[PDB]
Amino acid sequence: RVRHA
Amino acid sequence: ERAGPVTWVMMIACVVVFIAMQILGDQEVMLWLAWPFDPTLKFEFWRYFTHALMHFSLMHILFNLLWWWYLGGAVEKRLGSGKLIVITLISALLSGYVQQKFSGPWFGGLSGVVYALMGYVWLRGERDPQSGIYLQRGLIIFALIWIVAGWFDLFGMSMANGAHIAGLAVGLAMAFVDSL
């Protein structure tokens, strides 16, 4: 999963 | 009293990008706006910053923009537009650089800048009350919970660890520097 900033 | 131009334009930009994500898919928007993921993209200068404009769910965007609206709002009102632009650019750029170094270029969101803003508003108030800005006690707590939820991955989602730590560091560093 894409990392959430 | 209302959000100045920089606070506003960042909010609209994030919404427009979020809309485009819903119509185009997240992957098509990431192809355009993500940190360079191929050596051929290295001169597309916007990509070092625009990773900040991408959010992957309703809760992701709401939480990011709520903090931005409050903290960005406070900076812009007390210290002016220019200062918010510079804090945002530096935190977006550095947070991005640390995140890709940790985990590659697939990431996005405004939380690098938010963690900077939290660090900055807090430490500037502490070191320099004459500035006219500070983090109110209650928000110190909720900000502190936010940071703890980052360190310990309590949000229930894949986390940009490098963006968070670099973002917080930059806000503290910029506050230190401005408080002289």
PDB file of C-alpha atoms in Angstrom:
ATOM      1  CA  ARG A   1       0.000   0.000   0.000  1.00  0.00           C
ATOM      2  CA  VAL A   2       1.128   3.581  -0.858  1.00  0.00           C
ATOM      3  CA  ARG A   3       2.491   5.374   2.230  1.00  0.00           C
ATOM      4  CA  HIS A   4       0.304   8.058   3.801  1.00  0.00           C
ATOM      5  CA  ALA A   5       1.898  11.341   4.829  1.00  0.00           C
TER       6      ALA A   5
ATOM      7  CA  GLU B   1     -11.599  36.381  10.613  1.00  0.00           C
ATOM      8  CA  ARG B   2     -10.811  33.921   7.812  1.00  0.00           C
ATOM      9  CA  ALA B   3      -8.071  31.845   6.182  1.00  0.00           C
ATOM     10  CA  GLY B   4      -5.677  34.066   4.153  1.00  0.00           C
ATOM     11  CA  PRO B   5      -4.746  33.374   0.480  1.00  0.00           C
ATOM     12  CA  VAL B   6      -1.992  30.768   1.019  1.00  0.00           C
ATOM     13  CA  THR B   7      -4.140  28.735   3.470  1.00  0.00           C
ATOM     14  CA  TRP B   8      -6.966  28.801   0.989  1.00  0.00           C
ATOM     15  CA  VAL B   9      -5.087  28.067  -2.217  1.00  0.00           C
ATOM     16  CA  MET B  10      -3.423  24.949  -0.633  1.00  0.00           C
ATOM     17  CA  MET B  11      -6.878  23.705   0.437  1.00  0.00           C
ATOM     18  CA  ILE B  12      -8.385  24.178  -3.051  1.00  0.00           C
ATOM     19  CA  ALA B  13      -5.375  22.567  -4.730  1.00  0.00           C
ATOM     20  CA  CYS B  14      -5.679  19.515  -2.495  1.00  0.00           C
ATOM     21  CA  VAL B  15      -9.431  19.238  -3.265  1.00  0.00           C
ATOM     22  CA  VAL B  16      -8.877  19.582  -7.030  1.00  0.00           C
ATOM     23  CA  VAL B  17      -6.200  16.869  -6.924  1.00  0.00           C
ATOM     24  CA  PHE B  18      -8.463  14.704  -4.759  1.00  0.00           C
ATOM     25  CA  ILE B  19     -11.266  15.049  -7.338  1.00  0.00           C
ATOM     26  CA  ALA B  20      -8.884  14.146 -10.133  1.00  0.00           C
ATOM     27  CA  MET B  21      -7.869  11.078  -8.136  1.00  0.00           C
ATOM     28  CA  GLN B  22     -11.509   9.904  -7.916  1.00  0.00           C
ATOM     29  CA  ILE B  23     -12.147  10.327 -11.684  1.00  0.00           C
ATOM     30  CA  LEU B  24      -8.721   9.201 -12.975  1.00  0.00           C
ATOM     31  CA  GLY B  25      -7.659   6.677 -10.297  1.00  0.00           C
ATOM     32  CA  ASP B  26      -4.881   7.323  -7.757  1.00  0.00           C
ATOM     33  CA  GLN B  27      -2.290   5.675  -9.981  1.00  0.00           C
ATOM     34  CA  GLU B  28      -2.789   8.074 -12.945  1.00  0.00           C
ATOM     35  CA  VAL B  29      -2.487  11.127 -10.631  1.00  0.00           C
ATOM     36  CA  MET B  30       0.617   9.623  -8.968  1.00  0.00           C
ATOM     37  CA  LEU B  31       2.217   9.218 -12.414  1.00  0.00           C
ATOM     38  CA  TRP B  32       1.927  12.995 -12.830  1.00  0.00           C
ATOM     39  CA  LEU B  33       2.519  14.314  -9.297  1.00  0.00           C
ATOM     40  CA  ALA B  34       4.722  11.820  -7.396  1.00  0.00           C
ATOM     41  CA  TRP B  35       8.389  12.331  -6.457  1.00  0.00           C
ATOM     42  CA  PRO B  36      10.474  11.262  -9.511  1.00  0.00           C
ATOM     43  CA  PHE B  37      10.326   7.470  -9.749  1.00  0.00           C
ATOM     44  CA  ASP B  38      12.488   7.277 -12.908  1.00  0.00           C
ATOM     45  CA  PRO B  39      15.734   9.168 -13.935  1.00  0.00           C
ATOM     46  CA  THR B  40      13.796  10.608 -16.915  1.00  0.00           C
ATOM     47  CA  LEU B  41      11.574  12.560 -14.497  1.00  0.00           C
ATOM     48  CA  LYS B  42      14.394  14.210 -12.523  1.00  0.00           C
ATOM     49  CA  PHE B  43      13.982  17.701 -14.069  1.00  0.00           C
ATOM     50  CA  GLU B  44      10.179  17.876 -13.576  1.00  0.00           C
ATOM     51  CA  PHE B  45      10.740  20.146 -10.590  1.00  0.00           C
ATOM     52  CA  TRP B  46       7.131  20.271  -9.384  1.00  0.00           C
ATOM     53  CA  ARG B  47       7.344  16.569  -8.347  1.00  0.00           C
ATOM     54  CA  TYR B  48       9.649  17.408  -5.383  1.00  0.00           C
ATOM     55  CA  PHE B  49       6.680  19.309  -3.895  1.00  0.00           C
ATOM     56  CA  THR B  50       3.399  17.974  -5.434  1.00  0.00           C
ATOM     57  CA  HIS B  51       3.466  14.643  -3.534  1.00  0.00           C
ATOM     58  CA  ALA B  52       2.076  16.876  -0.763  1.00  0.00           C
ATOM     59  CA  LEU B  53      -1.181  17.486  -2.771  1.00  0.00           C
ATOM     60  CA  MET B  54      -2.211  13.780  -2.972  1.00  0.00           C
ATOM     61  CA  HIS B  55      -4.585  12.099  -0.500  1.00  0.00           C
ATOM     62  CA  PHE B  56      -5.809   8.480  -0.687  1.00  0.00           C
ATOM     63  CA  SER B  57      -9.086   8.518   1.309  1.00  0.00           C
ATOM     64  CA  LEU B  58     -11.717  10.803   2.816  1.00  0.00           C
ATOM     65  CA  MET B  59     -10.185  10.559   6.320  1.00  0.00           C
ATOM     66  CA  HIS B  60      -6.657  11.101   4.995  1.00  0.00           C
ATOM     67  CA  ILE B  61      -7.664  14.400   3.317  1.00  0.00           C
ATOM     68  CA  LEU B  62      -9.949  15.645   6.147  1.00  0.00           C
ATOM     69  CA  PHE B  63      -7.394  15.189   8.941  1.00  0.00           C
ATOM     70  CA  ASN B  64      -4.588  16.687   6.825  1.00  0.00           C
ATOM     71  CA  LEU B  65      -6.702  19.760   5.893  1.00  0.00           C
ATOM     72  CA  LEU B  66      -8.157  20.328   9.383  1.00  0.00           C
ATOM     73  CA  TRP B  67      -4.666  20.675  10.859  1.00  0.00           C
ATOM     74  CA  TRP B  68      -3.481  22.740   7.896  1.00  0.00           C
ATOM     75  CA  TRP B  69      -6.468  25.075   8.173  1.00  0.00           C
ATOM     76  CA  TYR B  70      -5.835  25.645  11.879  1.00  0.00           C
ATOM     77  CA  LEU B  71      -2.045  25.769  11.993  1.00  0.00           C
ATOM     78  CA  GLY B  72      -1.436  27.215   8.527  1.00  0.00           C
ATOM     79  CA  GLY B  73      -4.220  29.698   9.311  1.00  0.00           C
ATOM     80  CA  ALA B  74      -2.460  30.757  12.540  1.00  0.00           C
ATOM     81  CA  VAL B  75       0.988  31.189  10.850  1.00  0.00           C
ATOM     82  CA  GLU B  76      -0.440  33.258   7.964  1.00  0.00           C
ATOM     83  CA  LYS B  77      -2.521  35.516  10.256  1.00  0.00           C
ATOM     84  CA  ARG B  78       0.316  36.127  12.795  1.00  0.00           C
ATOM     85  CA  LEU B  79       3.466  35.987  10.592  1.00  0.00           C
ATOM     86  CA  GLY B  80       2.115  36.607   7.096  1.00  0.00           C
ATOM     87  CA  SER B  81       1.738  34.736   3.838  1.00  0.00           C
ATOM     88  CA  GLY B  82       5.407  34.662   2.904  1.00  0.00           C
ATOM     89  CA  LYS B  83       6.398  32.704   5.997  1.00  0.00           C
ATOM     90  CA  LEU B  84       3.774  29.960   5.347  1.00  0.00           C
ATOM     91  CA  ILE B  85       4.955  29.584   1.768  1.00  0.00           C
ATOM     92  CA  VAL B  86       8.538  29.071   2.936  1.00  0.00           C
ATOM     93  CA  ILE B  87       7.689  26.668   5.757  1.00  0.00           C
ATOM     94  CA  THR B  88       5.556  24.620   3.277  1.00  0.00           C
ATOM     95  CA  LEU B  89       8.155  24.446   0.559  1.00  0.00           C
ATOM     96  CA  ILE B  90      10.968  23.455   2.857  1.00  0.00           C
ATOM     97  CA  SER B  91       8.949  20.875   4.787  1.00  0.00           C
ATOM     98  CA  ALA B  92       7.478  19.409   1.546  1.00  0.00           C
ATOM     99  CA  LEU B  93      10.843  19.155  -0.045  1.00  0.00           C
ATOM    100  CA  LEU B  94      12.740  17.724   2.954  1.00  0.00           C
ATOM    101  CA  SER B  95       9.966  15.423   4.127  1.00  0.00           C
ATOM    102  CA  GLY B  96       9.839  14.066   0.600  1.00  0.00           C
ATOM    103  CA  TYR B  97      13.561  13.522   0.389  1.00  0.00           C
ATOM    104  CA  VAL B  98      13.687  11.612   3.687  1.00  0.00           C
ATOM    105  CA  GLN B  99      10.620   9.464   2.816  1.00  0.00           C
ATOM    106  CA  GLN B 100      11.938   8.344  -0.601  1.00  0.00           C
ATOM    107  CA  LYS B 101      15.320   7.565   1.011  1.00  0.00           C
ATOM    108  CA  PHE B 102      13.547   5.303   3.588  1.00  0.00           C
ATOM    109  CA  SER B 103      10.978   3.671   1.275  1.00  0.00           C
ATOM    110  CA  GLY B 104      10.978   4.901  -2.368  1.00  0.00           C
ATOM    111  CA  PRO B 105       8.810   7.469  -4.199  1.00  0.00           C
ATOM    112  CA  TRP B 106       5.284   6.076  -3.654  1.00  0.00           C
ATOM    113  CA  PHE B 107       3.789   8.242  -1.008  1.00  0.00           C
ATOM    114  CA  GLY B 108       1.737  11.332  -0.677  1.00  0.00           C
ATOM    115  CA  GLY B 109      -0.069  13.691   1.591  1.00  0.00           C
ATOM    116  CA  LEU B 110       0.245  16.987   3.501  1.00  0.00           C
ATOM    117  CA  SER B 111       1.319  15.458   6.832  1.00  0.00           C
ATOM    118  CA  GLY B 112       5.028  16.252   6.370  1.00  0.00           C
ATOM    119  CA  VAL B 113       4.010  19.948   6.303  1.00  0.00           C
ATOM    120  CA  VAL B 114       1.521  19.476   9.157  1.00  0.00           C
ATOM    121  CA  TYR B 115       4.070  17.897  11.482  1.00  0.00           C
ATOM    122  CA  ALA B 116       6.358  20.829  10.570  1.00  0.00           C
ATOM    123  CA  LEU B 117       3.620  23.299  11.414  1.00  0.00           C
ATOM    124  CA  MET B 118       2.955  21.595  14.773  1.00  0.00           C
ATOM    125  CA  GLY B 119       6.662  21.734  15.708  1.00  0.00           C
ATOM    126  CA  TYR B 120       7.013  25.273  14.446  1.00  0.00           C
ATOM    127  CA  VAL B 121       3.931  26.854  16.063  1.00  0.00           C
ATOM    128  CA  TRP B 122       4.738  25.142  19.381  1.00  0.00           C
ATOM    129  CA  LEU B 123       8.454  25.988  19.665  1.00  0.00           C
ATOM    130  CA  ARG B 124       8.061  29.538  18.374  1.00  0.00           C
ATOM    131  CA  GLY B 125       5.479  30.248  21.094  1.00  0.00           C
ATOM    132  CA  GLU B 126       7.760  28.725  23.750  1.00  0.00           C
ATOM    133  CA  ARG B 127      10.973  30.476  22.694  1.00  0.00           C
ATOM    134  CA  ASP B 128       9.488  33.728  21.417  1.00  0.00           C
ATOM    135  CA  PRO B 129       6.118  34.795  22.961  1.00  0.00           C
ATOM    136  CA  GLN B 130       6.647  38.316  21.461  1.00  0.00           C
ATOM    137  CA  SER B 131       6.099  36.705  17.989  1.00  0.00           C
ATOM    138  CA  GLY B 132       2.319  36.681  18.694  1.00  0.00           C
ATOM    139  CA  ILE B 133       1.905  32.954  17.871  1.00  0.00           C
ATOM    140  CA  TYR B 134       1.692  29.884  20.072  1.00  0.00           C
ATOM    141  CA  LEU B 135       0.145  26.451  20.311  1.00  0.00           C
ATOM    142  CA  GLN B 136      -2.739  26.564  22.828  1.00  0.00           C
ATOM    143  CA  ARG B 137      -2.503  24.028  25.672  1.00  0.00           C
ATOM    144  CA  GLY B 138      -5.341  21.858  24.467  1.00  0.00           C
ATOM    145  CA  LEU B 139      -3.930  21.586  20.968  1.00  0.00           C
ATOM    146  CA  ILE B 140      -0.518  20.835  22.374  1.00  0.00           C
ATOM    147  CA  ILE B 141      -2.229  17.670  23.741  1.00  0.00           C
ATOM    148  CA  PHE B 142      -3.976  16.753  20.511  1.00  0.00           C
ATOM    149  CA  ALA B 143      -0.856  17.546  18.495  1.00  0.00           C
ATOM    150  CA  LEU B 144       1.131  15.421  20.936  1.00  0.00           C
ATOM    151  CA  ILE B 145      -1.346  12.514  20.484  1.00  0.00           C
ATOM    152  CA  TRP B 146      -0.984  12.940  16.679  1.00  0.00           C
ATOM    153  CA  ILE B 147       2.794  12.603  16.927  1.00  0.00           C
ATOM    154  CA  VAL B 148       2.473   9.557  19.213  1.00  0.00           C
ATOM    155  CA  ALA B 149       0.013   7.991  16.717  1.00  0.00           C
ATOM    156  CA  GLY B 150       2.692   8.519  14.062  1.00  0.00           C
ATOM    157  CA  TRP B 151       5.595   7.040  16.044  1.00  0.00           C
ATOM    158  CA  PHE B 152       3.531   3.939  16.961  1.00  0.00           C
ATOM    159  CA  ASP B 153       1.457   3.618  13.760  1.00  0.00           C
ATOM    160  CA  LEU B 154      -1.938   3.914  15.476  1.00  0.00           C
ATOM    161  CA  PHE B 155      -3.817   5.391  12.482  1.00  0.00           C
ATOM    162  CA  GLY B 156      -4.661   2.005  10.859  1.00  0.00           C
ATOM    163  CA  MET B 157      -2.792   2.661   7.563  1.00  0.00           C
ATOM    164  CA  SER B 158       0.519   2.458   5.666  1.00  0.00           C
ATOM    165  CA  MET B 159       2.677   5.314   7.124  1.00  0.00           C
ATOM    166  CA  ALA B 160       5.239   7.686   5.641  1.00  0.00           C
ATOM    167  CA  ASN B 161       7.692   7.444   8.626  1.00  0.00           C
ATOM    168  CA  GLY B 162      10.473   9.496   6.968  1.00  0.00           C
ATOM    169  CA  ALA B 163       8.158  12.309   5.899  1.00  0.00           C
ATOM    170  CA  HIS B 164       6.832  12.556   9.516  1.00  0.00           C
ATOM    171  CA  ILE B 165      10.128  12.668  11.353  1.00  0.00           C
ATOM    172  CA  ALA B 166      11.761  15.016   8.777  1.00  0.00           C
ATOM    173  CA  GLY B 167       8.698  17.245   8.839  1.00  0.00           C
ATOM    174  CA  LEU B 168       8.702  17.595  12.607  1.00  0.00           C
ATOM    175  CA  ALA B 169      12.497  18.238  12.619  1.00  0.00           C
ATOM    176  CA  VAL B 170      12.216  21.027  10.071  1.00  0.00           C
ATOM    177  CA  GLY B 171       9.450  22.830  11.957  1.00  0.00           C
ATOM    178  CA  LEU B 172      11.521  22.751  15.153  1.00  0.00           C
ATOM    179  CA  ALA B 173      14.658  23.858  13.293  1.00  0.00           C
ATOM    180  CA  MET B 174      12.877  26.710  11.559  1.00  0.00           C
ATOM    181  CA  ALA B 175      11.304  27.821  14.851  1.00  0.00           C
ATOM    182  CA  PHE B 176      14.703  27.795  16.563  1.00  0.00           C
ATOM    183  CA  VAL B 177      16.186  29.848  13.761  1.00  0.00           C
ATOM    184  CA  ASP B 178      13.330  32.393  13.657  1.00  0.00           C
ATOM    185  CA  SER B 179      13.308  32.798  17.459  1.00  0.00           C
ATOM    186  CA  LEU B 180      16.837  34.360  17.390  1.00  0.00           C
TER     187      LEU B 180
END
